[PDB]
Ligand binder design. Structure first.
Ligand SMILES: CCCCCCCCOCCOCCOCCOCCO
Ligand SMILES: CCCCCCCCOCCOCCOCCOCCO
Ligand SMILES: O=C(O)[C@H]1CSC(c2ccccc2O)=N1
Ligand SMILES: O=C(O)[C@H]1CSC(c2ccccc2O)=N1
Ligand SMILES: [Fe+3]
Ligand SMILES: [K+]
Length: 670
């Protein structure tokens, strides 16, 4: 079953399989890629509210830029940036909240590392580091009436309902509802947040037919918006990170961000060896904000805050259609897939940058003036239109009793966009391109519990427009094609698994040359090693650990100051260690501890501005019991227990850490 939910692995904190785009779901041991899938059980035990909450705490390959006090999270994977807008939904792009994906309705959060253009086509944001994928909850046969209430520092009060039922003869239909409302002061100075959310997972199970519909509504409202710190022209050293409770940006900033979507999916078995599938979905996303980015000035901690208003109205549709089947050519079995997809978007995005206000890193800002931004009032004009569409064919060849598996495929990807001036309405650019893109993989199973593998696959990004100072100001460059080679090994001991991987990812870079011409003449070469252990090695001791090493080389630049240096915002070393322990001496009590480490990194391409390594420690506890015949669970989570302040590096800017943060919750099943 291509859409069959993979089972939980030993310990119940990760799953045994995950999605590979058009190929559907595959088991960890049958996948020639590094995949990880985190369960709803992990989400609930740790009290994780967003994708960033989950991945930062547990995964050694993923690091978050922005954070929960900002309006947006992005993610760094295998030394490249991954946009939140590029998070997939059962494989499909364009259907989840654009700036920050909430996960209290999710059954799984999967990470596939490296590019995967053949498997799912281009990402809307052009990300090539990896693909994160959410799986929605579904109604189980046993009905579910689950209520919890929660408290988060300093005054956020929340409630979450999770209710499921099935109906029709043979439980043919299912309905799962999730409702959340969390409101109050956050852990940062003079900030509050309000968050309502609604989701419905509906499904039908038939003899030859399976259908589902997912509906989601979400809104995040902030009074006070944290923003990055940018370098300046004369920055010579990065100052020490301030107390993470300080809020050094615009005092009276706000955000209102709303997203809602619907997607229908289906499968119909035409015969014992043929199946047709299709999906169609749409998303609306509305954005309103005034806030400011902080620019370093001098080198003792003084800043200038650069103010802006922004408004956004984004309309997206997303579709796929295909067939899957299987036939035997002697001692060779063919498992094949023919697939086509299509994304189309209309965007209105307006903005005005007015205001430069004095500040300081180590002081929470006073009320300052908000400039007159009424020139953006009224209807939001169209500024971009995008169309992405593709066709792909893939075939998995199995032989020697499935112990050798060779996968081949190719995809034709079309790209098109138009842009219009936000004040004038004038047509500015119209890009149209196509690219053919393939994959090849081979997996061998010398033992029933040991797999070895190698892959080759590509990533694609739309070309950038030249800056309006360069000689080719308006011109959009040709697409950037990344190429991955990977080899690895996976060893399942039954109770726990060890994996090892080595990869290389090469991708072109664009820079303004000596003659002031914008060109994709640069190249990046990221080579890395990945190690991980997860499972339940002793009864009642659950462990998730891992470590990565990457050399992110700027191997081709126009500048002797940057040639062969490291790409900015990529630490060479990263590690994570999580433990969860059912105490043998108290019935129903579980203790958790996590340690996250990020090594030193640079902010500039010349590597003149370094930022230090950092560590975060989390502590947790859960006590399960019964009242009047009902199961209940009380939980605590202390994030950043040691109260450390640290910068996360990116390309030309830094984002501040979150303060020590305690959350408490009580769950009951009725
Ligand atoms: C609980 C009923 C499930 C609703 C399924 C709707 C499927 C519609 O799909 C049509 C496009 O494919
Ligand atoms: C007024 C809202 C109350 C919601 C918070 C529930 C408090 C549960 O905390 C118990 C903490 O102990 C955890 C033991 O493990
Ligand atoms: O450049 C970007 O990526 C966007 C993300 S939101 C953003 C922003 C938002 C509010 C105020 C100022 C900003 O630069 N910048
Ligand atoms: O968020 C940032 O870093 C700044 C860089 S320029 C910038 C911007 C420029 C044009 C339009 C929107 C923007 O956010 N945002
Ligand atoms: Fe910006
Ligand atoms: K545009």
């Amino acid at each position: 079953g291509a859409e069959t939910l993979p089972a939980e692995y030993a310990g119940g904190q990760v799953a045994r399989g995950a999605r590979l785009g058009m190929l559907g779901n595959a088991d960890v041991m049958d996948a020639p890629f590094s995949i990880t899938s985190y369960t709803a059980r992990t989400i609930e035990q740790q009290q994780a509210r967003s994708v960033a909450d989950l991945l930062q705490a547990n995964d050694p390959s993923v690091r978050v830029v922005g954070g929960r006090g900002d309006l947006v999270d992005s993610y760094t994977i295998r030394g490249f940036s991954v946009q939140n807008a590029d998070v997939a939904f059962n494989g499909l792009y364009g259907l989840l909240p654009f700036w920050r994906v909430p996960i209290e309705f999710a059954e799984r959060v999967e990470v596939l590392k490296g590019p995967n253009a053949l498997l799912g086509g281009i990402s809307p944001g052009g990300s090539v580091g990896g693909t994160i994928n959410l799986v929605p909850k579904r109604a189980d046969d046993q009905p579910l009436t689950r209520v919890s209430v929660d408290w988060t520092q300093r005054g956020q009060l929340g409630t979450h309902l999770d209710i499921g039922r099935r109906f029709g003869e043979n439980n043919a239909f299912g309905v799962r509802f999730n409702g959340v409302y969390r409101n109050g002061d956050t852990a940062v100075d003079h900030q509050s947040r309000e968050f309502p959310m609604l989701s419905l997972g509906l499904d039908f199970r038939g003899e030859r037919l399976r259908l589902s519909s997912d509906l989601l509504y979400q809104k995040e409202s902030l009074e006070g918006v944290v923003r990055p710190l940018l370098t300046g022209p004369g920055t010579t050293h990065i100052p020490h990170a301030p107390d993470s409770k300080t809020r050094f940006g615009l005092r009276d900033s706000y955000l209102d961000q709303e997203d809602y979507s619907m997607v229908n999916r289906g499968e119909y078995d035409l015969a014992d060896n043929l199946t047709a599938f299709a999906s169609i979905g749409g998303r609306q996303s509305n954005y309103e904000t005034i806030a400011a980015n902080s620019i370093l000035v001098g080198n003792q901690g003084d800043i200038v805050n650069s103010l802006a208003r922004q408004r956004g109205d984004r309309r997206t549709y997303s579709a796929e259609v295909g067939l899957r089947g299987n036939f035997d050519t002697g001692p060779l079995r063919h498992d094949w897939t023919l697939s086509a997809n299509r994304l189309h978007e209309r965007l209105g995005m307006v903005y005005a940058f007015t205001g430069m206000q004095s500040g300081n890193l180590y002081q929470t800002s006073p009320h300052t003036p908000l400039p007159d931004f009424s020139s953006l009032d009224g209807s939001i004009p169209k500024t971009n239109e995008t169309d992405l569409g593709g066709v792909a064919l893939a075939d998995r060849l199995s032989f020697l009793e499935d112990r050798v598996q060779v996968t081949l495929g190719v995809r034709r990807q079309q790209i098109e966009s138009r842009n219009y001036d936000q004040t004038s309405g004038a047509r500015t650019s119209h890009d149209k391109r196509h690219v053919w893109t393939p994959m090849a993989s081979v997996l061998v199973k010398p033992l029933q519990d040991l797999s070895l593998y190698a892959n080759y696959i590509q990533g694609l990004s739309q070309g950038e427009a030249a800056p309006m100072t360069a000689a080719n100001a308006g011109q959009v460059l040709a697409p950037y094609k990344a190429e991955q080679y990977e080899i690895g090994a996976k060893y399942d001991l039954g109770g726990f698994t060890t994996t090892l991987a080595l990869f290389e990812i090469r991708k072109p870079n664009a820079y303004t040359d000596a003659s002031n011409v914008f060109r994709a003449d640069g190249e990046q070469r990221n080579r890395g090693v990945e190690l991980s252990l997860y499972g339940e090695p002793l009864d009642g001791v659950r462990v998730m650990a891992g470590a990565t090493y990457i050399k992110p080389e700027q191997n081709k630049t126009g500048d002797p100051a940057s040639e062969g240096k490291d790409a900015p915002g990529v630490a060479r070393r990263q590690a994570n260690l999580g433990v969860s322990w059912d105490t043998p001496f108290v019935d129903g009590l579980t203790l958790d501890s996590r340690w996250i480490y990020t090594g030193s990194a640079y902010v500039d391409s010349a590597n003149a501005l370094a930022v230090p390594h950092w560590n975060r420690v989390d502590l947790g506890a859960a006590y399960a019991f019964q009242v009047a015949g009902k199961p209940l669970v009380a939980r605590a989570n202390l994030e950043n227990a040691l109260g450390k302040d640290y910068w996360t590096a990116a390309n030309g800017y830094l984002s501040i850490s979150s303060p020590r943060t305690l959350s408490l919750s009580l769950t009951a099943d009725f």
